[PDB]
Amino acid sequence: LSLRLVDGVTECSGRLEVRFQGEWGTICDDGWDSYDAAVACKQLGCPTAVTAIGRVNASKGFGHIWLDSVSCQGHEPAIWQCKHHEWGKHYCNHNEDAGVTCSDGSDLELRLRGGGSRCAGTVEVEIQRLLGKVCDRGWGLKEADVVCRQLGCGSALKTSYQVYSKIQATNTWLFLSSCNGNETSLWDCKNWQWGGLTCDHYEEAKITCSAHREPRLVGGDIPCSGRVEVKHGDTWGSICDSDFSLEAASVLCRELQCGTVVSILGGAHFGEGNGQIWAEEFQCEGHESHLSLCPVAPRPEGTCSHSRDVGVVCSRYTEIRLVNGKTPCEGRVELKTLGAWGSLCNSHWDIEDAHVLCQQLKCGVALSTPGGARFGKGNGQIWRHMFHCTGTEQHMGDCPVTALGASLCPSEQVASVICSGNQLRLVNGGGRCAGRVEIYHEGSWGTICDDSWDLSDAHVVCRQLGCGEAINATGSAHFGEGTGPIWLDEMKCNGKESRIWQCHSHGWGQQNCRHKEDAGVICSEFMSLRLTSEASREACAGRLEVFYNGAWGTVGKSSMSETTVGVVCRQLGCADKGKINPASLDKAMSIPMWVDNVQCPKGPDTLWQCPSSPWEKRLASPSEETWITCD
Amino acid sequence: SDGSNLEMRLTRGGNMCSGRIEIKFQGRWGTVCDDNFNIDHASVICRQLECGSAVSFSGSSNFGEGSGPIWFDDLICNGNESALWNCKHQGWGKHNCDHAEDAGVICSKGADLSLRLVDGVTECSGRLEVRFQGEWGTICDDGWDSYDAAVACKQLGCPTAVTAIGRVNASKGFGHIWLDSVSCQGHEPAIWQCKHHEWGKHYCNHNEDAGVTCSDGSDLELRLRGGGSRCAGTVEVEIQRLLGKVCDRGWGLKEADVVCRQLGCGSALKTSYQVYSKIQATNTWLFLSSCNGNETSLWDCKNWQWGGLTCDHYEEAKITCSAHREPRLVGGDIPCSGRVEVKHGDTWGSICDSDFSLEAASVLCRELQCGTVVSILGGAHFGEGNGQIWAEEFQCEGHESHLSLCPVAPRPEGTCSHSRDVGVVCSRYTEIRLVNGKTPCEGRVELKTLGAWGSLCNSHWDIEDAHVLCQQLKCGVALSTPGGARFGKGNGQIWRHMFHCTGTEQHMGDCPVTALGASLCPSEQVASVICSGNQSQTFMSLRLTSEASREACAGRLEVFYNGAWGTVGKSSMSETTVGVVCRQLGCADKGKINPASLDKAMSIPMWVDNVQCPKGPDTLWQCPSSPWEKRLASPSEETWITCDNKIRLQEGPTSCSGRVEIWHGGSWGTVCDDSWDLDDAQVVCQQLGCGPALKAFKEAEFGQGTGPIWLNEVKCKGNESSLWDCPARRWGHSECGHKEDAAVNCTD
Amino acid sequence: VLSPADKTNVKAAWGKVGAHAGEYGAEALERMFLSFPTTKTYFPHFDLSHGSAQVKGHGKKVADALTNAVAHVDDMPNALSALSDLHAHKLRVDPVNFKLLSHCLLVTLAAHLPAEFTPAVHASLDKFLASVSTVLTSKYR
Amino acid sequence: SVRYQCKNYYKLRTEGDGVYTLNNEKQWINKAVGDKLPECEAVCGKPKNPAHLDAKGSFPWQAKMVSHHNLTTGATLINEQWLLTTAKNLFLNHSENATAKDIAPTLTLYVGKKQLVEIEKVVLHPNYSQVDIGLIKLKQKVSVNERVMPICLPSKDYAEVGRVGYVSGWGRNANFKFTDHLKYVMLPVADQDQCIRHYEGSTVPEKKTPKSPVGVQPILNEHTFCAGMSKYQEDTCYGDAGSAFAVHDLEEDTWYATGILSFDKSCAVAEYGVYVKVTSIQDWVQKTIAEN
Amino acid sequence: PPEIAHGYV
Amino acid sequence: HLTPEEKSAVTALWGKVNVDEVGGEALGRLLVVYPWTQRFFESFGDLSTPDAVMGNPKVKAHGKKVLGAFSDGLAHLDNLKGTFATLSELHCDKLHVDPENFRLLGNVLVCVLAHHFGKEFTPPVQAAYQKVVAGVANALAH
Ligand code: HEM
Ligand SMILES: *[C@@H]1O[C@H](CO)[C@@H](O[C@@H]2O[C@H](CO)[C@@H](O)[C@H](O)[C@H]2NC(C)=O)[C@H](O)[C@H]1NC(C)=O
Ligand SMILES: [Ca+2]
Ligand SMILES: [Ca+2]
Ligand SMILES: [Ca+2]
Ligand SMILES: [Ca+2]
Ligand SMILES: [Ca+2]
Ligand SMILES: [Ca+2]
Ligand SMILES: [Ca+2]
Ligand SMILES: [Ca+2]
Ligand SMILES: [Ca+2]
């Protein structure tokens, strides 16, 4: 007996031939396995590093067929000593002859072509100077991850492409059977056949890895903010503000794990770039997991000026850490504002905010919230940010939070949490502490009817929301017509209740009302804003007034920064900047002065977070009134 | 051979007195073929083996195929021989038969047959069991019907009055299934003397066991449970002392009619009810099979079954009947009108006027074959309903066929009693007859209005009107309209109501009617008709006048006729004529009559005199009066009136206070309190002539009772002449709730 | 062949099927059309879309025929004489399709009647449907 | 000298001796038959590797015939040039008035491993309404080998009650699909009375009725015998007609064609299948072979 | 020697 | 070939299967409904009645093996031929099992799946599983 490799791409590849009775013949491919290839290679003088099966570039078989279903355990060196049923007594045909592809290891290289970069596009094999394609006979994310992992790209998001086209085509294919997914290279995946079949009704394999387009943020002092740079596999560049949309931003903050978008900014606000400029139309539907997943338009011929960079800030921009504890899950709670650290005041801080802050740092569920200076007062300032977490989000920055002139905190009341270490909203009201009231029950949202609605009842809801006392209780659908179910008909609380579900009421579902009689509440902690003049009730040019405690008042001029006026205009929806100017002496209403010294930091989107001196009602001269004009 | 050496045997049976017939002769065992085999051969055979009284005979190897010679075939026996070999036959061993035709016999000495009932409510209700060869077994229900149950009940010796099938309350049996496809005619002395399937081959299972319930007829009851009356609810059955339901396997109106006829509730309308209560659970069911529809009771339906089946994925049978809320009109001085009293089962009661709308009036007039609503007269009228006052908020929608179907929303408290019951009128109130004819289908036409009979004129009488008339009087299609005094001259009042019937209408009251001023007719000119007599065969305007003001509801009255206007007589005008005039011109329910004034400006001749309206019409064109006569008239003869102002308050502590009521379309109503502002309350009290307003209320002030809400969202500017000029939206449609009617308090 | 026990099991099962027979037959036809597209060739004029009333009517017809057969289990060839002649001679339906429809029917009933399909009853129903199929295809030539 | 011998699966049938000695006249003369050579006939019934069972063994006499509308039936190879089949098989897709000349050019016939053989003429039985049998003549003799071999006719009646015979078939399987691979099944001979009662009601010529559980009546008469289902309830179905009921004679180690299947419509719904006795048709078969 | 059908010498 | 929707349906339903129960039930139903299949399992003891078949421990063990092999194929739906080469060689070389018996077992498995999963076994998933079992039978054919 004898062995021979014939008509392959190299002396160590091609159809397998065996001589018996002086006549050559081919082996039937049925059951041909990589073990058979290894045995046939060890019987021959070719490298034993890698052994793929199949006919590489070989033509159709001819002559006689000697053996079928050759089964080798790999324990002996010669092919014909393996197991077979009988010589020649088989029903195989010349279109299904076997083969092998011996290799030494340092020749198998995989490269993706036809797309935005090396980490996106069709998969293109090149082995022994013969270059082909992979087929979709068993292709999916499980096998996809290996190709992206092998190339230095990340997780495989989908099988598609965006940008470039016009790839070449060849009539040779790579077939995978199935490979669990943890391999360091595609070549390690078991029983990968090289050539032999032209797969019909199966298309070519395509990939788009995460490294196709990767976003980064650098130039900002608050954790989740700054200009946007995108990586094209191995190169970088800047992003203009013309072709970036909120849908893309929501994904940008989603994959970064910085929460959701709380502001999108244009221009070189975060700093002008010093590199190449990218130009790419972002067309995300909104719920995509990555920027690369979203479709993409081809590059335009134009380029933006470097003063046109973009930027974003997401919800999770509050740095919270625990100190002075034996474990990091028990120390006192600290926070930052305006470039200085500090310690949180516990004056308004419940178990819910402890649950959230424990979940933030993977400390599990919360256990207790010690009182007093139970972990040391600390050397930093005491912060006055009243937190109102709903107890489901998993970061502090997500929660509603406000500190505008919060009351002075007594010295020894520093907040702390002990971690395990493992449904009221006001709708259409504007703000958080006012509007039609709704409750979630039968797993559906519904409102409260207006009958018997009196100011005593309204006390309980805004103690439940933490919004202080009630100042109004409204009916005849003041804040719009509620939709869906109507649950609670009449309410007869004592005014001292902790939660609304403990009041005397007819019980869920019992009612005699119509949607034209939905109730509401306005409470002392609702805030609003306005810029007005003698000839306009509402505008964004004139004296600045603030709504709070049910009454209007003017904002203080002293200690007014340049960021404040920009925040004010942005909240009023006219401009991103503002200028102070002198004005007339004609006081419109001569309202009191609410809060003295406002100083808005970088990042917030409204004025209710920017910290200042605690509230106190006083009269003030017209010279102390803030008069703003928005460009 | 004289027959001494022969011997006969029965093999492959349950015992020595049953099995295949075998005979030894010439030393060989042999059988007999079943050709011409009958009970006579069996009786002869069950005599020489000492097993008595042949019970059944078999054929076609019911006991397995035999072997050996076949000795007999086509024998004829007389039923009383000493043995089988004494019968006449063609010859020993001569035959055209094979071993697929062996004969068999069951004799009585073995089959100690008996019958019993077990696992049921009484001594003879339950599951039937038959004893055969000492073993108890059941009967398959295939082919089991009332005649078989009759035979079984008579056999066991208990009442044969009502004999129904079904193993009530009894569980599936165990053991053999001895009988199947029993075919008794109803008079046999025992269940096994009838024709039935062979004892061996049955494919039945024990879920199919048969049973009977025998009764005298005094222990079967039927009731409707769950609902606001005895005439609506789930149909429940109490047979013996067992409670059960009916199954809707084939439930329909045809058998619901039988149930309702049994209970005495009229006729079946709907296969559902209003769930006024909760009914207990039960495990036994009654199954029916296609009642013909004209049975006097549900027990007479053929082959109804009492237990022994399941109603999986089906539900309970339920019905509402005609007598559930049947209406009545009482107290009315003229046909098809008067006070309403409703029946809830077998008790007649009144309904507050605060719970009856115009849809309810339409369904009522339709149900009583009175037409369509012409007037609602809410408030004590047509006397007083001295009895019980039902407090059920009727919520009738659409135009339901019967009052029973109308959804109703009861309340747990008491309400109005003997001051605000309600009345109704319909369009079927015409008093007419035929007189002076040889038969009731020909004669003179007469009509009664007020309190007098008179002769109707033929001025506009036509064949269509004649056909409608004879359709009213059950005389079929009309034939011709003879002219003149063909049935006598007039001898009294000459009415002149020119009717305009289209001819497709069942009763003449529903036609358009015109009477005001209608043309004079002589006594010799009267209307008359002749008809087949077989039932099987099938512009004007009213205006008022005043200087510098027209179309207002105060001043002199006039009638447009034949291209011109004219005046109508002041003489003898009654209160009811005024009420009709005001309800027609729409400025009020009624008003008062006053002398003439200086405001007249047109000397127009008089068209009619002596206007007097009857009870029932809602317009002035249907009011008798003198004929047309274009005579000159003096102011003392001219008629002048002033309707009652449409806006009136009620429930107020005094005058110039109280909820704001409004009248339109025939019946009074209220206004909705959305946008209720002092401008409207300024119009309200000035319109009363009282003074400026001082306050307006919201959220259920001054009553929340009766009426339709004729207006809502009164955007009144405050200087309006009338509350009806305001741009109030969707006149007549209730967008608002009822807890929010108008209220005003204003300065005297 | 159908033994007496098999006939009892068939009678019990088809009794429990009850009034849902038309629904089960229509569902079986839908299953067959969805799983074996080649069967659609014999219904060229039929709107074979989901829930088509024509398919529902044909399914109820099939279920009624099967119930008639169960009633006359001892004389099935006479009970299905006209249907046998129709399928064998006028339509020339190939016998393979009948096993497909029988399998679809068994799948439908097993899906909807879990408690009734004891393996013995399953075998009896197979026997009954095989007998029906053999009767309906015997004259095929 | 030379001695004549017949190759594998053949046998010399002439008398005398196959040894021929060369003459001084240079003539080849066997001292028994002189100038006359012998001829080699074919073994009839000795399968190389004897014995719903898949056939990967020795049923060489089985033939497959397909009608011109793609219906498959069976035939049995009786000698090198003639086959025995069912008349109803030949009458597929034409009125029973058709002549034998209209049937021959419309049939395809396979033997062994899908080897095609051509047909010259067909001879139906003179009384095919009662003896449902037909003969097929091939254009040229088939070459006997491991896959093709006749099953020659019997000399005595093996249709005894209880005898188990083998039936190969190309017909429809449990899914009513024509079988891809040849199968065989072992069936016993049943008694006539039960079969006749099962299909016709009674053994009496009068008061017979059609009681066939499948709706089609077999041809039951004195030229037929019945065979029941197997130990595992396996039966023949459509397309097995024309196949032989082969009996293994252990005293001679020869396989004999005892019957040809006629009624193949039981399909486990009817208890018995009906076969035509070969011993009752042997004279007509021999007369038709010799007359052609 | 002459051949015979299906036979050898 | 199977469309991605079909593969999703197949692999979603297959997760709720008790691999130690369904196989034995399917094999027992095959042996009862088609008696000739008992010929290959004469070593399992009493197989003469449905109760004996359904109560046999060897039947359940072998059904477990069969369903394990079936599940292994469900992860290689595009290369069934090579997945089942050794089993095909076994079933042809030693037992000589006719290829139609594979289709009978597949249909019985479909019936068992419908029986277990009730109304969730909508016609589309049935068609998908028909394609799967047809592929497995063709692969095991030879
Ligand atoms: C248990 C098996 C079957 C039964 C009991 C059955 C029953 C019926 C019935 C009751 C009819 C109506 C005949 C009439 O209305 O006159 C019919 C007609 C028909 N059957 Fe079947 N059927 C079966 C299987 C099949 C199969 C498997 C096919 C095709 C794959 C098929 C194709 C047809 C067609 C095309 C019609 C004609 C329908 C029409 O003309 O509207 N049947 N069958
Ligand atoms: C509830 O809100 C209403 C307005 O939305 C307030 O009513 C006004 O209160 C001011 C307070 O000085 C009075 O001057 C006005 O006359 C009030 N308006 C009316 C129409 O009477 C009300 O004060 C709020 N409730 C509370 C407790 O402040
Ligand atoms: Ca209210
Ligand atoms: Ca309250
Ligand atoms: Ca209420
Ligand atoms: Ca007889
Ligand atoms: Ca006789
Ligand atoms: Ca029954
Ligand atoms: Ca009866
Ligand atoms: Ca209101
Ligand atoms: Ca208004």
Numbering used by the authors:
A (entry chain B): 264 to 685, 718 to 926
B (entry chain A): 152 to 689, 821 to 1030
C (entry chain D): 2 to 142
D (entry chain F): 47 to 97, 107 to 347
E (entry chain G): 36 to 44
F (entry chain E): 3 to 144
The authors write:
In both cases, we observed a single SP domain of Hp bound to an Hb αβ-dimer, and this was coordinated by either two or three CD163 ectodomains. In both the dimer and trimer, multimer formation is mediated by the base, predominantly due to interactions between SRCR7 of one subunit and SRCR9 of its neighbour. The dimer adopts a similar global architecture, with the arm of chain A of CD163 (CD163A) making the same contacts with HpHb as in the trimer, but with the second arm making different interactions. While each arm adopts a very similar conformation, flexibility in their relative positions occurs due to rocking motion within the base. This allows the arms to emerge from the base at different angles and to make different contacts with the asymmetric HpHb head. Flexibility of the CD163 base, therefore, allows its arms to mould to the ligand, likely allowing a scavenger receptor to create different binding sites for differently structured ligands. PISA analysis shows that the arm-arm interactions have a total interface area of ~590 Å2, while the dimeric and trimeric receptors have total contact areas with HpHb of ~930 and ~1445 Å2, suggesting that HpHb will effectively compete with these arm-arm interactions and explaining why we do not see these auto-inhibited CD163 conformations in the presence of ligand.
